[PDB]
RNA sequence: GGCCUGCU
RNA sequence: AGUAGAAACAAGGCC
């Protein structure tokens, strides 16, 4: 059924680079949209980014524009995420996700089916 | 009241009085097209050149009393200097976007009823069902086909009288439409658009487009139906065929 | 290793990759200064291709004219305009015999059209040479000025509202001793008979720009308004004739041209048995227009209009009669520079008759010396031949007659030929049992062409076996192959307005996908690039970006105000939902269900001060001059939104002595708007009648006040006020 | 008879009847009794309608003279006395407001009480026949009809008479006044029967006067009049006249076919002269990039601050000095301009917020460099005629120049891959159809192939530079403006980056015509020493501005770093066409997609993936001294993209002419290679037509050399 | 120095 | 100088 793993998590100094990764199985990966939500310590989760089934329509949060890039590869069933010039408060646990609709805009952006094994500080 | 009043004001001044007196009705068109403005030879070059100016578009004088002369930071939205050969004033493109964020609002529920052709296209496509793409050489042969899928089996002149009687019932003149199909079309499009206030000219133009049959010569392979020709770009290619069934069927 | 794209043709046939040989991604060549040199060169060239004719001096215009018709037969392969009257009459007779009833029918429909045509049809034309001001002006303006001058001189038959009556007045003007014109610097000037004759028989010459496919620039001509009605009638007859000829391809579009070419090649090759060989000639005609004598067109039309009412024959014959005596204005003039004194000067062309030749180079000096004898009142007589394809359709008729003259019934030999002719270009499929037969057939076709004043360009023509050829940038190789390089210039923002540009771009992508075999991925790339250029041109960026522009603030506040931001138009900084499946839908209707009702109402508000509609003709029609072709009009699907504004006008008239034209424009537009408010159908159907404005307006005021009281807002007080105000304007018009 | 209408009736009615006379286009001198009859009809219409008013009740108020008041309503409102268009206007308006039925013919009056029409007609004949006559003319009519006749009798259906009887006594008194006044005149020999319904006309278009004489001078040489020529044409019949002249015509008039064989075509001759120079508006192969590694997007950001930040990233500035002079200008002006640009850049760096656009001072340096006040003053010919030096503008064939090897290498390196992605495409509607998915996959493949290509970088450079230049020219027409050359890319690691090639100073740009020239001065950093190919930099001035240290295994190079400075110019058309350089991507990839589709029509399956990955099939895309070299489909993509980019960069009339006249010969050669027995009528003429387009443009000369190489490799 | 126009 | 190429730009006119 829904299977989602994480990778790349590790402590790092500020102003540095990092690349995360995910993985899927049990469904058509090239037919559903993904997101990334993060839960900060003692704060509810919020959305970070979204992406469509083409690799084309991307959006971002107001406070992280230009510093986060998102890109998927349907062939290997993964979902990368590159964050550069990381802010101090960005340290938190990051949670993969899977939308229901193929598009992104329709409906409100919130996680629906995933578990965030991956973290970062 | 007003109309005859600006008529009298025009006749007050000698030049306009002479223009109104000596000019006959037939010459109406000529003097209406009488202009010093040449038709542009390279529209793209100047559209890319004019949009870099301030006040590149034109709007009616009424804009000066609906939109403020400047926005929050002081960027000017319109100017009081009139166009070359018209009473309209040159205004900035922001006055457009401003009108779309704080301008007066109305009830656009009847635009779908007016622009019947485009909304019918949208409805037909929204409920369409695609199929597998088959790759094989397509023998595109050129044929004469009808593009308009809503033509009511009327020609240009044949439906022009219908359109006038629907929009301009008083200027019909001698003609009283005999064919009963035209009778029902007039009844329907009269009761449907009874108070629509978009414009008489645009209503007439869109009725002409919807009812009048139009035909063009195109390279087709299969299909040949009116609904299947509007999507001819999506269903037929050089070496691929995309099975499609519009929402109508 | 050195990269060389041309070597790609060693594996891909030339026609399958011909798009690579079309450098239509750069700026096309433009002319910079005067076109007088080209005009003089064309006049001299036209006169020297017919040098062996006979000279005469017109008793009316006093200009020297050269008649080469029935002149000595050519003895060389150089271009020659010595057409033979009997040969062309025989060709037309054979054309009639092969297509019985063609001329009689075409004349019948032409007679119907001529006797029911109106004057306003002349307004539907591009720039025309107004003789009242001696300059090019819009067709409507020139027509209005000429009508005003005629009415001031006493020629008021055009008040009947009939084009035939306007032409009657035009001809009657030719027999007047003294006409009067107006000039601003207003001064009333008197024109004698000869001066007015030359002003009515003259043409204005300009230089053609944006012409791709040749190193040298050319000159083109624009006629006056007195001769355009006869030209309209003659071209109507020629179009009606050509529509009955399958060998013609001028009155049709491109796809019809391709279909007819395929049909003719299949007919010629398929009917040919194993013994007969087939060869295709991809022929271009050198100096097509310069070698077509108007007298021969007169002969063709008078043969066509045999056994017809004499008035029809006269009205159709007036046009070639005037072309045979046509004059050409030399042009803008010549600009000189003096580097020693560091100055520049601009001498008008009219001084070329008397100005000394010390300022001109050797080439221009000789051109002026050769053209001076033909200079009459600042314009050169150009009797020998047409200037620039004014009689396109009659030339196509002559070419089709030549093509049909080899139907194997007139050849009287084993060889035969057919093909397709479109003025200045042709494809000729010739079949014969042996190479000797093909050679004889092509030789006889060339010889017959030289007897009709038509020359074949040997340098731009070649013959191969049938199955591969070219015709008007259409390359046939066992089936037509798409090019897509001819339509590349049309992939940008058209330049009409925001909504119009969006719709035109998407529709052009769609059409080039349907016709020019544009690929799906290529179409998607074109859509992306067009959207990028559109946003960068109209300063309408996605709104979620930080691209500061003159319009990025209002767009951003509209973005933050809207809740369903997916419904915003690209013009207002919204996302683009277009794709290969959505190329046939207007943007407004594609985003209708996603727009917020507030933004939707603000956008499509009839009371918006930006939307302006003038006539039914200019509602959703955009004139895009295609590359390598004549000006064309396109229907584009668009919804009347606040983005349908019309752009600013030139505004340079304010610094010219012709400044009063703007006041007249404003007053005419005010009167027209008042009439439209009085007569709502003024735009959709142009009103007809013989009454004057104020009569109709006041009388309709009477009646409408009446009836709108019998049910409506009016009241007795207001109704009587309107009645007595109508009486007031009546007595005002009295005095 | 017309004397009667001169005498009795008032003006108003006589001119109303005269305009009604003009209405249907018949003349009054031939038959006037109709005029009198219908004017009497119109008179009875008035006299029946006027003097009859109504108030809020029914029961019309009848007053001999309308008193001043709002109570001037007319009982009967007239139909006739108007044009047909307005008569039908009133008919339709009454029908639409009164809800009544529309008659098919013209009524005469409308009334409120009975809410209907009146068709008044007073005929000479007695009423009791004319009434039912007009009644059977009108179909199923509810409009009441009422007619009088001269004897004095009245009649109507329903026995209905709609108003006062004293008015009708008025009518018949008027009637007998008419009658026993003609009695004094004496017209009844025709008055009863004078109109019978004649409608006929012949259209007359007569050639006469001067226009006839012109017709007599537009005939064949041996004709004297248009009458005689038309008679001859009508009497003409085909009797084998083309054959006679064909036999008599000289046999030297022929179209003999010259066979086209492998040994026939000769290589195109190239012009000889001084080597060809560089014409581009910016450096293509010798560009250098100063970067910041910022996260901003292409359009996002402010130019001046980005340029200053990029330039501060480089250390090693030296006092600039001349290395290679312009050879025709004043190099010290270029040096001073460079130092001025640096000084004013620092001046911006100091102040509060970097301006979005900066204007520079108009010093003599840039006054000369931008060509200011050099256009000769325009004067009148009558004041300058004795000046010996006064002559035409120099109008001759351009200078001849021979091809050089630098353009070949520039094109070679314009098709090479790079370490960056120079295209960031926009968004499209999410793909819904499988064909859309195929298109998207194809597009992604081509973008992966072409994004890392110097051609895309040149496209972006040209687009940005021309857009900025056009916008500045249209906005700051008068004052010189500074614009840093900026291009934003994305590294392999994914980090976005900005690049600053140099600066452009735009000058006065009062551009009226599409050909008017705006002059600017361009400065660009580079490392390529100009002492190795000087002939390529004829119009450039190159200084030494610093030293650069790029990490290399040979210690560290510490190369020199020069500044290419030149005066260039453009025009509105050139700017517009250079800002649409992205359609080169289209051209190229449309060609490649056409190849893919054509090959996939053979094998019934999409063939894109194996073409782009397996790379088994290859096309001839260049020649090495060993022989012809073939490359994968991606290399063909890049080569075609570079060809289109160079077409857009080095565009000129020479290119168009050569392209056309060489496509002709290419088609002929293809026909030869296809075994189609091609033939030509004058091949030397075609060769001369091709060779006249090759004058001095490096791009067209390179194309001609490529064509010669293709001919040499072909024809085997 | 002040003001006008940028296809007329 | 420069752009460009069979003639032009390198502002125009009006006070």
DSSP, collapsed to helix, strand or coil, labels residue D153 as coil
Strands C202-207 and C327-329: parallel
Identify the burial level of A74 via C-beta atoms within 10 angstroms of its C-beta, where 0-12 means exposed, 13-18 middle and 19 or more buried.
middle
Which tokens sit at B39?
Answer: 């038709």
What is chain D's length?
A: 716
Q: Is D41 annotated as a binding residue?
A: yes
Residue D603: alpha-carbon gap to chain centroid: 43
C540 in Cβ contact with B51 (< 8 Å): no
Q: What angle do CA D674, D676, D679 make, to 5 degrees?
A: 120
Q: Which domain holds residue D122?
A: 1-199
The torsion of the CA quartet C140, C146, C150, C156, rounded to 10 degrees, works out to -20
Taking the C1' atom of E8, which residue's CA lies nearest? Answer: C653
Domain that holds residue C585: 491-635
DSSP conformational letter for D460: H
Burial label, D674 (beta-carbon count in 10 A; 0-12, 13-18, 19+)? middle
Closest residue, CA to C1' of F1: D329
In this complex, do C566 and A106 lie within 8 Å of one another by their Cβ atoms?
A: yes
Contacts of residue C427, defined as CB under 8 A and 6 or more positions apart, other chains included, come to C261, C264, C280, C281, C282, C283, C419, C420, C469, C470, C471
- Counts for chain C of helices (H) and strands (E), in that order: 21, 23
**Chain D residue at shortest CA distance from A52:** D430
Residue that the structure tokens 């990955």 belong to: D613
Structure tokens at B242: 């995309």
CA(C197)–C1'(F15) in Å? 41
In eight-state DSSP terms, residue A103 is S
Rounded Cα distance, C133 and C145, in Å: 9
How many residues make up chain B in this entry?
249
Question: Which chain B residue's Cα is nearest to C568?
Answer: B100
Which residues pair with residue D157 across a beta bridge? none
From B242's Cα to the closest Cα of chain D, the distance in A is 7
Burial-class residue D262 by CB neighbours within 10 Å (0-12, 13-18, 19+). Answer: exposed
Residues lying close to strand E (Cβ under 7 A), chosen from 179-198 of chain B, are: none
What residues does D570 pair with on adjacent strands? Answer: D518
**B interface test, pick of D22, D90, D140, D435 with most B CB neighbours within 10 Å:** D435
**B38 CB less than 7 Å from any atom of strand E:** yes
Number of H helices, E strands in chain A: 0, 8
**Alpha carbon distance C556, A62 (integer Å):** 14
The answer to whether residues D524 and D563 touch, using CB atoms and an 8 Å cutoff, is yes
Looking only at the bridges linking them, the beta strands covering D481-491 and D358-359 are antiparallel
- Positive or negative, the Cα torsion across D204, D208, D211, D212? positive
Please state, in angstroms and rounded to a whole number, the distance separating the CA atoms of residues C549 and D319: 37
CA angle C179, C180, C182 (to 5 degrees): 150
Cβ distance A102 to A32 under 8 Å? yes
Degrees to nearest 5, angle at CA D695 with D693 and D698: 105
Q: Are residues C119 and C246 in the same domain?
A: yes
- Domain map of chain B by residue range? 1-249
Based on the fold, state whether residues C618 and C679 are members of the same structural domain. no
Question: Do C575 and A106 lie within an 8 Å CB cutoff?
Answer: no
C449 and C505 in a single domain? The answer is no
In whole angstroms, give the CA distance from residue A36 to residue A95. 6
Q: If residue C220 lies in a helix (H) or strand (E), which one and from where to where?
A: strand C219-222
Which residue, chain included where needed, has tokens 């010798």? D286
Other Cβ atoms less than 10 A from the Cβ of D344: the count is 15
Residue D443, CA distances (Å) to B105, B232, C17, C509, D415 in order: 42, 21, 20, 16, 19
Which domain, by its residues, includes A83? Answer: 1-121
How far apart are alpha carbons C410 and C444 in whole angstroms? 12
Compute the distance between CA of residue C675 and CA of residue D5 in angstroms, rounded to an integer: 35
Q: How many CB atoms lie within 10 A of CB C59?
A: 11
Strand pairing of A58-60 and A46-51? Answer: antiparallel
Resolution in A: 5.3
CA–CA separation, D453 and D448 (whole Å): 10
Beta bridge partners of D146: D120, D156
D477 touches strand E (CB under 7 A): yes
Q: If DSSP states are collapsed to H, E and C, what string results for D336-404?
A: HHHHHHHHHHHHHHHCCCCCCCEECCCCHHHHHHCCCCCCCEECCHHHCCCCCCCEECCCCCCCCCECC
Domain with D179 in it: what CATH number? 3.40.91.90
Provide the pairing of β-strand D481-491 with D496-506.
antiparallel
End-to-end CA distance of chain B: 53
Q: List C-alpha distances in Å: A105 to A33, A50, A102.
A: 11, 9, 10
First to last CA, chain A: 30
Cα–Cα distance between A48 and A40 in angstroms, integer?
A: 12
The count of structural domains within chain A is 1
* 8 A C-beta contact, residue C3 and residue D415: yes
Cα(C675)–Cα(C671) distance, integer angstroms: 6
Interface residue of D656, D684, D697 to substitute, partner C, most C CBs within 10 Å: D656
SS percent in chain D: helix, strand, coil, step 5: 40, 15, 40
C-alpha D522/C-alpha D462 separation (Å) is 13
Q: Which two tokens stand for residue D465?
A: 């530079």
CB C665 within 8 A of CB B88: no
**Cα–Cα distance, D544 to D564 (Å, whole number):** 9
Q: Are D91 and B169 spatial neighbours (Cβ–Cβ below 8 Å)?
A: no
With CA atoms as reference, report the closest residue to C492 among D579, B52, D643: D579
Residues of D at the B interface, defined by Cβ within 8 angstroms: 84-85, 88-89, 92-93, 96, 102, 104, 432-435, 438, 470-471, 474-475, 514, 572-573, 576, 579, 594, 597-598, 600-602, 604-606
Name the experiment that determined this structure.
cryo-EM
Chain C residues with CB under 8 Å of A50 CB are none
Cα R_g (chain A), whole angstroms? 14
Q: Where is chain C discontinuous (C–N over 2.5 Å), named by the preceding residue?
A: 185
User: Which residue's CA shows the smallest distance to C1' of E4?
Assistant: C655
Q: Are D633 and D615 in contact (CB under 8 A)?
A: yes
What is the CB neighbour count within 10 angstroms for residue C39?
A: 29
Final residue before a domain boundary, out of C434, C452, C481: C481
The candidate with the shortest Cα–Cα distance to D134, out of D113, D114, D117, is D117
Of C433, C259, C459, C260, the residue nearest D668 (C-alpha): C459
Count Cα atoms within 13 angstroms, Cβ side, for C302. Answer: 29
Together in a domain, C517 and C562: yes
Protein contacts on strand F: list nucleotides below 7 Å from a Cβ.
1-13
CA nearest to C36, candidates C47, C28, C44: C44
C310 and C409, same domain (yes or no): no
Query: Are residues A29 and A46 in contact, defined by beta-carbon separation less than 8 angstroms?
Result: no
Q: Is D162 on the interface with C (CB under 8 A)?
A: no
The length of chain C is 735
Decide if C16 contacts D591 (C-beta within 8 A).
no
DSSP string, D630-648: EE-HHHHHHHHHHHHHHHH
C482 token code pair:
């798409």
CB of A13 within 8 A of CB of A25? no
Q: Is residue C295 classed as helix, strand or coil in its secondary structure?
A: helix
Which two three-digit tokens encode residue D382? Answer: 């009558």
Strand E nucleotides with an atom less than 7 Å from a protein beta carbon: 4-8
Cβ contacts (< 8 Å) between C525 and chain A: which residues? Answer: none
**C230/C320 Cα distance (integer angstroms):** 9
Burial bucket for residue D186 (CB in 10 Å: 0-12, 13-18, 19+): exposed
> What are the angstrom distances between the C-alpha of C649 and each of B35, C136, D417?
11, 18, 47
For chain B, how big is the Rg over CA atoms in Å?
24
CA separation for the pair B29, C672 (Å, rounded): 9
Element (H, E) at C676: helix C660-678
Instruction: State the Cα–Cα distance between residues D634 and D631, nearest whole angstrom.
Output: 8
The total number of structural domains that make up chain C: 4
Chains that touch C (3 or more CB pairs under 8 A): A, B, D
Nucleotide nearest to C27 (CA to C1'): F4
Whether C470 is in a domain gets the answer yes
CATH number at residue C272: 3.30.70.270
d(C-alpha C522, C-alpha D446), whole Å: 10
- Write the CA distances from D315 to D305, D318, D344, D547, D562, integer angstroms: 18, 9, 19, 8, 14
Pairing of strands B240-245, D559-571: unpaired
Phi, psi torsion values for C539, nearest 5 degrees: 60, 35
Q: What are phi and psi of C420, to 5 degrees?
A: -135, 135
């Amino acid at each position: 059924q829904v299977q989602l793993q994480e990778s790349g998590g590790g402590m790092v100094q500020p102003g540095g680079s990092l690349r995360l990764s995910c993985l899927a199985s049990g469904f058509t990966f090239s037919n559903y949209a993904m997101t990334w939500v993060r839960q900060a310590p003692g704060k509810g989760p919020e959305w970070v980014s979204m992406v469509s089934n083409n690799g084309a329509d991307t959006t971002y949060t107001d406070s992280v524009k230009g510093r986060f890039t998102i890109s998927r590869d349907n062939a290997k069933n993964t979902l990368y995420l590159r964050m550069n010039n990381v802010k101090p408060e960005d340290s938190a646990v990051y949670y993969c996700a899977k939308r229901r609709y193929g598009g992104i805009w329709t409906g409100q952006p919130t996680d629906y089916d995933y578990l965030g094994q991956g973290t970062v500080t | 009241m007003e109309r005859i009043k600006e008529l009298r004001d025009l006749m007050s001044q000698s030049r306009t009085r002479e223009i109104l007196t000596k000019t006959t009705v037939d010459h109406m068109a000529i003097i209406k097209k009488y202009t010093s403005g040449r038709q542009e030879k390279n529209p793209a070059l100047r559209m890319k050149w004019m949009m870099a100016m301030k006040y590149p578009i034109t709007a009616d004088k009424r804009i000066m009393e609906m939109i403020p002369e400047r926005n929050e930071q002081g960027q000017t939205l319109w100017s009081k200097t009139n166009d070359a050969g018209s009473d309209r004033v040159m205004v900035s493109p922001l006055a457009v976007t401003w009108w779309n964020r704080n301008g007066p609002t109305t009830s656009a529920v009847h635009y779908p009823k007016i622009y019947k052709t485009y909304f019918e296209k949208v409805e037909r496509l929204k409920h369409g069902t695609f199929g597998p793409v088959h790759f094989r050489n397509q023998v595109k042969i050129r044929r004469r086909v009808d593009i308009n899928p809503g033509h009511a089996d009327l020609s240009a002149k044949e439906a022009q009288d219908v359109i006038m009687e629907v929009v301009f019932p008083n200027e019909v003149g001698a003609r009283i439409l005999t064919s009963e199909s035209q009778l029902t079309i007039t009844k329907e499009k009269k009761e449907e658009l009874q108070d629509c206030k978009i414009s008489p000219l645009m209503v007439a133009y869109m009725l002409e487009r919807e009812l009048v049959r139009k035909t063009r010569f195109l390279p087709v392979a299969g299909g040949t139906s009116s609904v299947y020709i509007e999507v001819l770009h999506l269903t037929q290619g050089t070496c691929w065929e995309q099975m499609y069934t519009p929402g109508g069927e | 290793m050195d990269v060389n794209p041309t070597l790609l043709f060693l594996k891909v046939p030339a026609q399958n990759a011909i798009s690579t040989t079309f450098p239509y991604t750069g700026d096309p060549p433009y002319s910079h200064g005067t076109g007088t040199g080209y005009t003089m060169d064309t006049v001299n060239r036209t006169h020297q291709y017919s040098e062996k004719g006979r000279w005469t001096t017109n008793t009316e215009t006093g200009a020297p004219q050269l008649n080469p018709i029935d002149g000595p037969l050519p003895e060389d392969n150089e271009p020659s305009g010595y057409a033979q009257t009997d040969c062309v009459l025989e060709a037309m007779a054979f054309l009639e015999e092969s297509h019985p009833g063609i001329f009689e029918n075409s004349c019948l429909e032409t007679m119907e059209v001529v006797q029911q045509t109106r004057v306003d049809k002349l307004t539907q034309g591009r720039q025309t040479y107004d003789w009242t001001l001696n300059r090019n002006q819009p067709a409507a303006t020139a027509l209005a000025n000429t009508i005003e001058v005629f009415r001031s001189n006493g020629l008021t038959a055009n008040e009947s509202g009939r084009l035939i009556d306007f032409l009657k007045d035009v001809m009657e003007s030719m027999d007047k001793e003294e006409m009067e014109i107006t000039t601003h610097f207003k001064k009333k000037q008197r024109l004698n008979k000869r001066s007015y004759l030359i002003r009515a028989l003259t043409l204005n010459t300009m230089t053609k720009d944006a012409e791709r496919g040749k190193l040298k620039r050319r000159a083109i001509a624009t006629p006056g308004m007195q001769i355009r009605g006869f030209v309209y009638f003659v071209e109507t007859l020629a179009r009606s004739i050509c529509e009955k000829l399958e060998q013609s391809g001028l009155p049709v579009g491109g796809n019809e041209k391709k279909a007819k070419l395929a049909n003719v090649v299949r007919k010629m090759m398929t009917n040919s048995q194993d013994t007969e060989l087939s060869f295709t000639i991809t022929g271009d005609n050198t100096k097509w227009n310069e070698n077509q004598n108007p007298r021969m067109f007169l002969a063709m039309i008078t043969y066509i209009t045999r056994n017809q009412p004499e008035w029809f024959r006269n009205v159709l014959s007036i046009a070639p009669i005037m072309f045979s005596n046509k004059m050409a204005r030399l042009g803008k003039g010549y600009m000189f520079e003096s580097k020693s004194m560091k100055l520049r000067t601009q001498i008008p062309a009219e001084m070329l008759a008397s100005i000394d030749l010390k300022y001109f180079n050797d080439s221009t000096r000789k051109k002026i010396e050769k053209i001076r004898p033909l200079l009459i009142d600042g314009t050169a007589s150009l009797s020998p031949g047409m200037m620039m394809g004014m009689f396109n359709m009659l030339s196509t008729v002559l070419g089709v007659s030549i093509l049909n003259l080899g139907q194997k019934r007139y050849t009287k030999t084993t060889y035969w030929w057919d093909g397709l002719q479109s003025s200045d270009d042709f494809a000729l499929i010739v079949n014969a049992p042996n190479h000797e037969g093909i050679q004889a057939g092509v030789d006889r076709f060339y010889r017959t062409c030289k007897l009709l004043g038509i020359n074949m360009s040997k340098k731009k023509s070649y013959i191969n076996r049938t199955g591969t050829f070219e015709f008007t940038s259409f390359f046939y190789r066992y089936g037509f192959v798409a090019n897509f390089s001819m339509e590349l210039p049309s992939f940008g923002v058209s330049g009409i307005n925001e909504s119009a540009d969006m719709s035109i771009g998407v529709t052009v992508i769609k059409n080039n996908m349907i016709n020019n075999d544009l690929g799906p991925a290529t179409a998607q790339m074109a859509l992306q690039l067009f959207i990028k250029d559109y946003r960068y041109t109209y300063r309408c960026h996605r709104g979620d970006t930080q691209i500061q522009t003159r319009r990025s603030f209002e767009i951003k506040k509209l973005w933050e105000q809207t809740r369903s931001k997916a419904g915003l138009l690209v013009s207002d900084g919204g996302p683009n939902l277009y794709n290969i499946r959505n190329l046939h839908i207007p943007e407004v209707c594609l985003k209708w269900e996603l727009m917020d009702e507030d933004y939707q109402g603000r956008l499509c508000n009839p009371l918006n001060p930006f939307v302006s509609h003038k006539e039914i003709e200019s509602v959703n029609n955009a004139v895009m001059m295609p590359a390598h072709g004549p000006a064309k009009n396109m229907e584009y699907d668009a919804v009347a939104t606040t983005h349908s504004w019309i752009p600013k006008r030139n505004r340079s008239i304010l610094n010219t002595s012709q400044r009063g034209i703007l006041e007249d424009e404003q007053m005419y537009q005010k009167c027209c708007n008042l009439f439209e408010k009085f007569f709502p159908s003024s735009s959709y159907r142009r009103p007809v009648g013989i009454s004057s404005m104020v009569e109709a307006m006041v009388s309709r005021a009477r009646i409408d006040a009446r009836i709108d009281f019998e049910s409506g807002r009016i009241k007795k007080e207001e109704f009587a006020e309107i009645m007595k105000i109508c009486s007031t304007i009546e007595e005002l018009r009295r005095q | 008879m017309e004397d009667f209408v001169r005498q009795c009736f008032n003006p108003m009615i006589v001119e109303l009847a005269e305009k009604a006379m003009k209405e249907y286009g018949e003349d009054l001198k031939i038959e006037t009794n109709k005029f009198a009859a219908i004017c009497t009809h119109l008179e009875v219409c008035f006299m029946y309608s006027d003097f009859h008013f109504i108030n809020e009740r029914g029961e019309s108020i009848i007053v001999e003279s309308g008193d001043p008041n709002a109570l001037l309503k007319h009982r009967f409102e007239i139909i006739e006395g108007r044009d047909r268009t307005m008569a039908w206007t009133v008919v339709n308006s009454i029908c639409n407001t009164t809800g009544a039925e529309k008659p098919k013919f013209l009524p005469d009056l409308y009334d409120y009480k009975e809410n209907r029409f009146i068709e008044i007609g007073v005929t000479r004949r007695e009423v009791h026949i004319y009434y039912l006559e007009k009644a059977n003319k009108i179909k199923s009519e509810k409009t009441h009809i009422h007619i009088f006749s001269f004897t004095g009798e009245e009649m109507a259906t329903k026995a209905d008479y709609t108003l006062d009887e004293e008015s009708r006594a008025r009518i018949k008194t008027r009637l007998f006044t008419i009658r026993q006044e003609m009695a004094s005149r004496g017209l009844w020999d025709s008055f009863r029967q004078s109109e019978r319904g004649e409608e006929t006309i012949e259209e007359r278009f007569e050639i006469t006067g001067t226009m006839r004489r012109l017709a007599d001078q537009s005939l064949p040489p041996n004709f004297s009049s248009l009458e005689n020529f038309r008679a001859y044409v009508d009497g003409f019949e085909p009797n084998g006249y083309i054959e006679g002249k064909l036999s008599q015509m000289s046999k030297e008039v022929n179209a003999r076919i010259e066979p086209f064989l492998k040994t026939t075509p000769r290589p195109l001759r190239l012009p000889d002269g001084p080597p060809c120079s560089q014409r581009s508006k910016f450096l293509l192969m010798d560009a250098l990039k100063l970067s910041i590694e910022d996260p901003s997007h292409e359009g996002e950001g402010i130019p001046l601050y980005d340029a200053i930040k990029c330039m501060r990233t480089f250390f090693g500035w030296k006092e600039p000095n001349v290395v290679k002079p312009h050879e025709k200008g004043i190099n010290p002006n270029y040096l001073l301009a460079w130092k001025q640009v640096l000084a004013e850049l620092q001046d911006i760096e100091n102040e509060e917020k970097i301006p979005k656009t900066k204007n520079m001072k108009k010093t003599s340096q840039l006054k000369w460099a931008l060509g200011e006040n050099m256009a000769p003053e325009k004067v009148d010919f009558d004041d300058c005629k004795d000046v010996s030096d006064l002559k035409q503008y120099d109008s001759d064939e351009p200078e001849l120049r021979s091809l050089a090897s630098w353009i070949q290498s520039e094109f070679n390196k314009a098709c090479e891959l790079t370490d960056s992605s120079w295209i960031e495409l926009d968004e499209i509607g999410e793909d819904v159809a499988p064909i859309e998915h195929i298109a998207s996959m194809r597009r992604n493949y081509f973008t992966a192939e072409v994004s890392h290509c110097r051609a895309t970088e040149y496209i972006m450079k040209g687009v940005y530079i021309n857009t900025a230049l056009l916008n500045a020219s249209c906005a700051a027409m008068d004052d010189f403006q500074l614009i840093p050359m900026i291009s934003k890319c994305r590294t392999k690691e994914g980090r976005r980056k900005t690049n600053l090639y140099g600066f452009i100073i735009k000058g006065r740009s009062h551009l009226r015509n599409d050909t008017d020239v705006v002059n600017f001065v361009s400065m660009e950093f580079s490392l390529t020493d100009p002492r190795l190919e000087p002939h390529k930099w004829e119009k450039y001035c190159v200084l030494e501005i610093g030293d650069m240290l790029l990490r290399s295994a040979i210690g560290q190079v510490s190369r020199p770093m020069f500044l290419y400075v030149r005066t260039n110019g453009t025009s509105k058309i050139k700017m517009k066409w250079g800002m649409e350089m992205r359609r080169c991507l289209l051209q190229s990839l449309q060609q490649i997609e056409s190849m893919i589709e054509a090959e996939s029509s053979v094998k019934e399956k999409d063939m894109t993936k194996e073409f782009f990955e397996n790379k088994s099939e290859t096309w001839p895309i260049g020649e090495s001294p060993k022989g012809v070299e073939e490359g994968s489909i991606g290399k063909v993509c890049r080569t075609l993209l570079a060809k289109s980019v160079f077409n857009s960069l080095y565009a000129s009339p020479q290119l168009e002419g050569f392209s056309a006249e060489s496509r002709k010969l290419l088609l002929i050669v293809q026909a030869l290679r296809d075994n189609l027995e091609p033939g030509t009528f004058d091949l030397g003429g075609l060769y001369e037509a091709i060779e006249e387009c090759l004058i001095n443009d490096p791009w067209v000369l390179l194309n001609a050399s490529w064509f010669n190489s293709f001919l040499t490799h072909a024809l085997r």
